[PDB]
Every structure is written in C-alpha cells, then in structure tokens.
CSV table of C-alpha atoms and ligand atoms in Angstrom, one decimal:
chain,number,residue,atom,x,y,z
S,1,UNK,CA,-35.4,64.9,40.8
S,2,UNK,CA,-36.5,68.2,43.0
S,3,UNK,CA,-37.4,67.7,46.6
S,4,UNK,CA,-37.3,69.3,50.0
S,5,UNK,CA,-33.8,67.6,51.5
S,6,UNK,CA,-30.1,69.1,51.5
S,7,UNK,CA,-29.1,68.0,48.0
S,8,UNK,CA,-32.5,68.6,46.3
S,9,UNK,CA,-34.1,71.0,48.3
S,10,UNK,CA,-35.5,74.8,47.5
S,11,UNK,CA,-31.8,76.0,47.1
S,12,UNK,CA,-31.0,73.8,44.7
S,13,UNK,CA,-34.0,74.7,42.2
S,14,UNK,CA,-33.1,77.3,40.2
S,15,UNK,CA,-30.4,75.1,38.5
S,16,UNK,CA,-33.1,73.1,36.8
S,17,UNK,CA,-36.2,75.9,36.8
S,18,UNK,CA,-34.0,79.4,36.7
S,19,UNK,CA,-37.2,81.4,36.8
S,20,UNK,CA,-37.1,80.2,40.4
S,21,UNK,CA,-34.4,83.7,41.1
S,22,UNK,CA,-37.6,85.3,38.9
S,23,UNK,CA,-39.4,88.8,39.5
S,24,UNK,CA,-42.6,87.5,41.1
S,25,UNK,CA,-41.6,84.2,43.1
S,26,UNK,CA,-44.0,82.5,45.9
S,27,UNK,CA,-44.4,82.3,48.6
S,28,UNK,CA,-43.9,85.8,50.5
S,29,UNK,CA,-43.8,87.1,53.8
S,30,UNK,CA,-46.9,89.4,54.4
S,31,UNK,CA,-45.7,92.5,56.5
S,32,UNK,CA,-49.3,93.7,57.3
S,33,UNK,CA,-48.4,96.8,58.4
S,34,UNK,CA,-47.4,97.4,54.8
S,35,UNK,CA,-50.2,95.6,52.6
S,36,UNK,CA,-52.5,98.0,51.7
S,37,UNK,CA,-56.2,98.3,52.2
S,38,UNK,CA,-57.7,98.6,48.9
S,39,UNK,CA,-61.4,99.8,48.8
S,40,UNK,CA,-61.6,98.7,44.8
S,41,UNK,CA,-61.4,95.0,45.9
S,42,UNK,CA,-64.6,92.9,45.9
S,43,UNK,CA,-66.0,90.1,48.0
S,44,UNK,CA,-64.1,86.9,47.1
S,45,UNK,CA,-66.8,84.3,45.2
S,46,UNK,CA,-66.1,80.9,46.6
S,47,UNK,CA,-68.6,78.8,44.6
S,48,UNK,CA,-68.3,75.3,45.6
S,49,UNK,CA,-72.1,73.3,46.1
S,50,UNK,CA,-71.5,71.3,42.9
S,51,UNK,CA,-67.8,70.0,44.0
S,52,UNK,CA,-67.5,67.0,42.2
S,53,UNK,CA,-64.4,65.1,44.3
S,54,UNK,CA,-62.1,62.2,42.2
S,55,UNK,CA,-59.2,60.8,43.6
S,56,UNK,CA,-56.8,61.3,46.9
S,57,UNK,CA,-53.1,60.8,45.7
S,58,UNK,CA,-49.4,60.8,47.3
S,59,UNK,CA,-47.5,62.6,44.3
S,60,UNK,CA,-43.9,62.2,46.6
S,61,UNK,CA,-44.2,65.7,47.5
S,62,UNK,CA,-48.0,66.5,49.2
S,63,UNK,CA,-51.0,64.4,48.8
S,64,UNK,CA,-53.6,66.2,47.1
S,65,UNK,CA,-57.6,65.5,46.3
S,66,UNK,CA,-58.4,66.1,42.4
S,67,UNK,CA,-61.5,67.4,41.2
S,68,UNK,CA,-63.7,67.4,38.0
S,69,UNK,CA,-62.9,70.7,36.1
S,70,UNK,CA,-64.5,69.5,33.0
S,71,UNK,CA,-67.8,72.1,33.5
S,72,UNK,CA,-68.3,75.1,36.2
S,73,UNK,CA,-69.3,72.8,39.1
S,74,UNK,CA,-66.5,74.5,41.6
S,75,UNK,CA,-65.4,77.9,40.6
S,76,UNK,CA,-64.1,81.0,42.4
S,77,UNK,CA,-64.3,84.7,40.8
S,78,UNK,CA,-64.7,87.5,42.1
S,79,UNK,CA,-62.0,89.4,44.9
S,80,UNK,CA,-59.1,91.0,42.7
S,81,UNK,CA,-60.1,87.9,39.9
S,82,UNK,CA,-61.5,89.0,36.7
S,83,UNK,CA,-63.4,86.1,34.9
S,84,UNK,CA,-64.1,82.8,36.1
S,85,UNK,CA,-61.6,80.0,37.8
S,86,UNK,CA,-62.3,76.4,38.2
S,87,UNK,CA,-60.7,74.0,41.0
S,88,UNK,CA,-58.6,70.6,39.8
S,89,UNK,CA,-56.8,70.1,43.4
S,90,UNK,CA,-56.4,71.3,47.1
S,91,UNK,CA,-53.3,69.9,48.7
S,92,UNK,CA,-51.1,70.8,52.0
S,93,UNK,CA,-47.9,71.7,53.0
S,94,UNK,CA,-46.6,71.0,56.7
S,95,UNK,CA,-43.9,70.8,59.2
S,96,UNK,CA,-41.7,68.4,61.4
S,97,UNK,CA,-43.1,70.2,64.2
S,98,UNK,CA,-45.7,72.9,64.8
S,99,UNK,CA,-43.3,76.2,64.3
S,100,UNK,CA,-43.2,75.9,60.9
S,101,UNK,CA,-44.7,74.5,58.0
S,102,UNK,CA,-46.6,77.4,56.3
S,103,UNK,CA,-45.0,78.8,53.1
S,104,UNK,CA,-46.4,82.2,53.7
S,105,UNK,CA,-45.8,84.1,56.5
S,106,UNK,CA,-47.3,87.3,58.5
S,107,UNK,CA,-45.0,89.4,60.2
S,108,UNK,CA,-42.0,86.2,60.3
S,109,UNK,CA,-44.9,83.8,61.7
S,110,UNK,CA,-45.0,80.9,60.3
S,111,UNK,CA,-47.8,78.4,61.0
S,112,UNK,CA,-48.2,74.8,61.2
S,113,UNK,CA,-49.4,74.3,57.7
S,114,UNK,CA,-51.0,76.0,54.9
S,115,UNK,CA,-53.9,74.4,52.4
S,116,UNK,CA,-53.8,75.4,48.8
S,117,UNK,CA,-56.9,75.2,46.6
S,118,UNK,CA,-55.4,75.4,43.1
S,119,UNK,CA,-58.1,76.9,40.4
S,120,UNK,CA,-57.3,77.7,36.7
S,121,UNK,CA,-59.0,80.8,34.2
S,122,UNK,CA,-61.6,78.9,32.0
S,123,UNK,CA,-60.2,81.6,29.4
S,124,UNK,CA,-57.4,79.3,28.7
S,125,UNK,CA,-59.3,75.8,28.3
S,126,UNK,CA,-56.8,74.0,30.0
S,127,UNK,CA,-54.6,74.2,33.1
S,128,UNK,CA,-51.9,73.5,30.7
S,129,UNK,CA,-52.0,76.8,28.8
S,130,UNK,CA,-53.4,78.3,31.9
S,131,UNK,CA,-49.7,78.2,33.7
S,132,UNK,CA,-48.2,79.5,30.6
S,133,UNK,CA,-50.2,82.7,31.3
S,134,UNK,CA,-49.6,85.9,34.0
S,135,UNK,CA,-53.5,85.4,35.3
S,136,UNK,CA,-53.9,81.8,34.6
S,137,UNK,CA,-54.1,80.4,38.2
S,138,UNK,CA,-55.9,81.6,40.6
S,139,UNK,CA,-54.7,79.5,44.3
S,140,UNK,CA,-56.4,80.0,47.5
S,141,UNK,CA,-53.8,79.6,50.7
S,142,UNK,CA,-55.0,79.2,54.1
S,143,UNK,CA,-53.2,78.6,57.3
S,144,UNK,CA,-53.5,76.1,59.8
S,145,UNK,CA,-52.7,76.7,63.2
S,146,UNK,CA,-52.9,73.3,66.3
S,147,UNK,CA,-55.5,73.6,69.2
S,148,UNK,CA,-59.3,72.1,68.0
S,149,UNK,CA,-60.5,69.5,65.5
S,150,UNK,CA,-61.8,70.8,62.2
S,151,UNK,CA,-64.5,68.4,61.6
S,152,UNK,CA,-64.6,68.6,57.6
S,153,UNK,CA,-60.9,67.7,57.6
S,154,UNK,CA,-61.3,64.0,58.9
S,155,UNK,CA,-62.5,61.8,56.2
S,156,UNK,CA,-59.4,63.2,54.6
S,157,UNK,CA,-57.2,62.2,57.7
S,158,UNK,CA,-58.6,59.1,57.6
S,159,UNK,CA,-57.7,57.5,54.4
S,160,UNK,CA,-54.2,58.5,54.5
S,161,UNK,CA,-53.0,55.3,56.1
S,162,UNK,CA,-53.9,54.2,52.3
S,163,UNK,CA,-51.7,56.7,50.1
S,164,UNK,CA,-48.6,56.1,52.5
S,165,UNK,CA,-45.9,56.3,49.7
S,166,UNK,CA,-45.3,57.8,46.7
S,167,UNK,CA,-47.4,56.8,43.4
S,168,UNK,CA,-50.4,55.3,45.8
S,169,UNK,CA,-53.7,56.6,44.8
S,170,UNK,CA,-57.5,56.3,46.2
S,171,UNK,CA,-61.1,56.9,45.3
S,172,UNK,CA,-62.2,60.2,47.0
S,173,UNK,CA,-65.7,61.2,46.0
S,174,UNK,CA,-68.2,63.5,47.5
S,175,UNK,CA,-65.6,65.5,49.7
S,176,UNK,CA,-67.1,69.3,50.0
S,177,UNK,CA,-64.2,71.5,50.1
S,178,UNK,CA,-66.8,74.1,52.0
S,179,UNK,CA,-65.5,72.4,55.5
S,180,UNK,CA,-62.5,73.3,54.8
S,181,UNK,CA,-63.1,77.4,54.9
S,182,UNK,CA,-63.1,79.6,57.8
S,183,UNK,CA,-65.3,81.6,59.1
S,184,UNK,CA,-64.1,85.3,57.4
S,185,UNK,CA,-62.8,85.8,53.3
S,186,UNK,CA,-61.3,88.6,54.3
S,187,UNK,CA,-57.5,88.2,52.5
S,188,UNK,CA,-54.4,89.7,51.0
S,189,UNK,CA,-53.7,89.2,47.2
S,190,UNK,CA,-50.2,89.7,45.2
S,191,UNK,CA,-48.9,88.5,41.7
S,192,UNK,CA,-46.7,85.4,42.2
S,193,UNK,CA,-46.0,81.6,41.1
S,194,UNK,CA,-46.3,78.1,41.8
S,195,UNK,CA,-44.1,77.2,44.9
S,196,UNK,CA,-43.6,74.0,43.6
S,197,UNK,CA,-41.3,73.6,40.2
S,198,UNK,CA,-41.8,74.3,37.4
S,199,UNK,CA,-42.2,77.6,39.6
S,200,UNK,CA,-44.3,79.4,36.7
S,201,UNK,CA,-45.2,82.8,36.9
S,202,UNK,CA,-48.9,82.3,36.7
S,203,UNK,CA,-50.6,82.9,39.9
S,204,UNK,CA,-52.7,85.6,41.7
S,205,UNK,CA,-52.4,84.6,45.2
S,206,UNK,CA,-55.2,85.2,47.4
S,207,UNK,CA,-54.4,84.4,51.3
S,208,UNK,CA,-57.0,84.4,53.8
S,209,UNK,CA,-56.3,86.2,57.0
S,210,UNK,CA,-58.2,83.9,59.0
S,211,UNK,CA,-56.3,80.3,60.0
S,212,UNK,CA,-58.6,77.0,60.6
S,213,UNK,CA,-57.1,75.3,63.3
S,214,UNK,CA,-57.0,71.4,63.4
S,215,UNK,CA,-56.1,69.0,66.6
S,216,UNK,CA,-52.4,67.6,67.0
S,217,UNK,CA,-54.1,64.2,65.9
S,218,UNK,CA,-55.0,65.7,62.2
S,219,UNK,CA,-51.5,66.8,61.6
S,220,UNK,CA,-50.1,64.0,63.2
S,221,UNK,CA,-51.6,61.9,60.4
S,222,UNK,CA,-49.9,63.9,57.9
S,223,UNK,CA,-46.1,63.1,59.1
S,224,UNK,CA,-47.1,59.4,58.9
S,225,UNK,CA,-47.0,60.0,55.1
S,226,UNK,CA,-43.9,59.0,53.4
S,227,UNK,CA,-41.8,60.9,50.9
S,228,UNK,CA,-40.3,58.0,49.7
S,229,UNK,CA,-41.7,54.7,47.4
S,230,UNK,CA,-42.9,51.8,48.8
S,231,UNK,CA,-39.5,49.3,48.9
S,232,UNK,CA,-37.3,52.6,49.1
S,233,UNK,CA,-35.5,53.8,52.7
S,234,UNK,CA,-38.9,55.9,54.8
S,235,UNK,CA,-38.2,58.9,54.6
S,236,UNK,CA,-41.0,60.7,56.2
S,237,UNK,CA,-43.1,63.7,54.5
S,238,UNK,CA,-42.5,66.5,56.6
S,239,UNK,CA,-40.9,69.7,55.3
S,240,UNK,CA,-42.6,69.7,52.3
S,241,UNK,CA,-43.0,73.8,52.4
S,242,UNK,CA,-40.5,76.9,50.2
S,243,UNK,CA,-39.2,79.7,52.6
S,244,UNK,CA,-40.4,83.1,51.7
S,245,UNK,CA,-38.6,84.8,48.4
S,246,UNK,CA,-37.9,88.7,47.6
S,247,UNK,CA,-40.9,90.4,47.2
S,248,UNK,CA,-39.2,92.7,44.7
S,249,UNK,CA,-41.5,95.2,43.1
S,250,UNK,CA,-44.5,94.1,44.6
S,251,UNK,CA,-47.2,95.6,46.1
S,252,UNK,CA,-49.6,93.2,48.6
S,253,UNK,CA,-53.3,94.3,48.7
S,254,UNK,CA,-55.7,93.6,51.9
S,255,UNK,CA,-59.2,93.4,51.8
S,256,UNK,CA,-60.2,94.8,54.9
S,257,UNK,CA,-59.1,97.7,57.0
U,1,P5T,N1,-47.9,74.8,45.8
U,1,P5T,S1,-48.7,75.3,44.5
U,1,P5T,O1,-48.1,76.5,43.9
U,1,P5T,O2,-50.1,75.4,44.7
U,1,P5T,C1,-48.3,73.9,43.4
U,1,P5T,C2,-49.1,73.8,42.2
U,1,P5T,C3,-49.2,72.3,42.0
U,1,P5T,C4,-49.5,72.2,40.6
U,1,P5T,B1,-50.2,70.7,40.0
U,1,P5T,B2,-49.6,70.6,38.3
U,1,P5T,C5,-48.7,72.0,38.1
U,1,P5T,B3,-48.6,73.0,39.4
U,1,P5T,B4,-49.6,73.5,38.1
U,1,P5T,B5,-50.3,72.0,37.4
U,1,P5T,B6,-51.3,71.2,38.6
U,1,P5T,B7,-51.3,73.0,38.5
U,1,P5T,B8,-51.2,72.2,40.1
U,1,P5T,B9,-50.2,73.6,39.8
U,2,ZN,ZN1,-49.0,74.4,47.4
C-alpha cells in the first residue's frame, strides 16, 4: 500500500502505477518568468452559493470534505475550461514544518501547504469515467503560507480532533468553500494528473497566484492527524505532498501580465 515514507513513498510509485514516469505528471514547478501570458484566457467561474457539504473524512493520506455532485449546485467553468465542472472534494497537503509542504512550486518556493478543490466534466456523468479522460478533472490548487488566521478555515480545524486516524469519518454540512478563496483568480494553468496514485492523466490544473495564509495554530491542527489506524504505531500525517516532476513538453499559461 502507497504512502509518503521511505519504502512506500513517491519514488517507489511507479512500480505499481508506471504512468507515474508519464508525459504530463503533477505537480510542477512554475518558473514564472517562463509561463506565458495568454490574452485568449477568460475569467475563472467559481460558482459555489449552492455548496451542498457531506462528510469530513481521514482517508490515511489527507482528510478531505465531500460534496453533493449529484446536480450543478458547486461548479467551476470558465478560465482555460470548456464546459462545465462540478466539486466532490477539497483536501490538503502539508509539511513537518513550514518550508515545505506545497506540491507546486514558484521559482523553487515551496509553501507551507497547498488546498486542492477536485471538480469533474459533467460531460462524463461520473468522476469514474471522468479520470479516464485527458479534460475530465478540472482541480483548483492554492497555497498556503503561516502569519494570520483565515477565518473560513476553522470549523474545519476544529473537528479534526474527531477524524484522528485513518477510516474515521464525520458529518460536515453547510461548509461554504467561498472562505476558503483569496482575494485575486488570477492563475497559471497546464495539462497534468492526479498527484496521488492512480496518477491519471486527467487534469487541467489551474493554480492561483495568490496564497491564503492561515495562523501556526491552523496548521498546527493538521500534524495532530495521524497517518496510521487507530490500534496501529502513530505515525503522524505530515509529509503528505509529491515533489515537482519533469515538465517535459509543456507549456504553463498565466492569466495576468
Ligand atoms: N492530489 S489530487 O491530484 O487532487 C488527488 C485526487 C484525489 C482523488 B479522489 B478519488 C481519485 B483521485 B480521483 B477520484 B476522487 B478523484 B479525487 B481524484
Ligand atoms: Zn491533492
């Protein structure tokens, strides 16, 4: 079973998921010197006043909050998108310590954490089929950087104390996603993949320049969680991030001059 650690870690991957040494692998470093402005671009459509919240859930390798994606309720479209994307999940990745944690990087920085909002093409029906296509997934990175509280991130800080170890679960309803967003959609956007196995091919990433930051208490809360079952050896959930891969033949857009 994959994981983060020495024997089971990123480097290890590719033996069960070989796409992992694939042509379009995430996450990236973004040199921004290179990404180029692109005036064809549009205004990214974040559409999410019907949010409909489900469940908070340690899976053993994030926590994530799960959505309805039955009906239109949270979509984005819009930016380099063409059709229409609904939201199942947002989870985290984060560090041992504030250097690093981030799975993209700008210029070699790495920040303390990055938030994915994970939406699939309504073309496909399900998000099932949707990974087995180029433009399935459409997933929505932000950084995180330490210094100020972000308000809307505390009700999730506080019920982690109840998802501790793997498999743990909780009711999570009417979280809006909307105080989790910065200020600015200005972003860069590439053709990539999950960073997570099965490591499909299937994503347009679209990363937001701006970071949110959050207090040293917030993130502190998140290295409390526990890789690990409850009854198993604590192993604490930190680390949970994929270094940058090749960018290969790529080309990353920006949004903004
Ligand atoms: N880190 S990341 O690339 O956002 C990880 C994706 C986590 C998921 B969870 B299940 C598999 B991969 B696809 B489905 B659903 B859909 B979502 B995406
Ligand atoms: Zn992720």
């Amino acid at each position: 079973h994959w994981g983060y650690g020495k024997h089971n870690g990123p480097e290890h991957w590719h033996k069960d998921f070989p796409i992992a040494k694939g042509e379009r692998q995430s996450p990236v470093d973004i040199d921004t010197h290179t990404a180029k402005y692109d005036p064809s671009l549009k205004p990214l459509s974040v559409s999410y006043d019907q949010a409909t919240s489900l469940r908070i859930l340690n899976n053993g390798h994030s926590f994530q909050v799960t959505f309805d994606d039955s009906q239109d309720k949270a979509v984005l479209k819009g930016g380099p998108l063409d059709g229409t994307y609904r939201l199942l999940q947002f989870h985290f990745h984060w560090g041992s310590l504030d250097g690093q944690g981030s799975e993209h990087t700008v210029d070699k920085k790495k920040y303390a954490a990055e938030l994915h909002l994970v939406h699939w093409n309504t073309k496909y029906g399900d998000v099932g089929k949707a990974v087995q296509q180029p433009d399935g997934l459409a997933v929505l990175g932000i950084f995180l950087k330490v210094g100020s509280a972000k308000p809307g991130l505390q009700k999730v800080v506080d019920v982690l104390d109840s998802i501790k170890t793997e498999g743990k679960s909780a009711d999570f309803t009417n979280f809006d996603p909307r105080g989790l967003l910065p200020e600015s959609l200005d972003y860069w956007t590439y053709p990539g993949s999950l960073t997570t196995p099965p490591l499909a091919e299937c994503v347009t990433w679209i990363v937001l320049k701006e970071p949110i930051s959050v207090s040293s208490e917030q993130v502190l809360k998140f290295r409390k969680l526990n890789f690990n079952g409850e009854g198993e050896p604590e192993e604490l959930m930190v680390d949970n991030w994929r270094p940058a891969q090749p960018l290969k033949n790529r080309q990353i857009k920006a949004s903004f001059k």
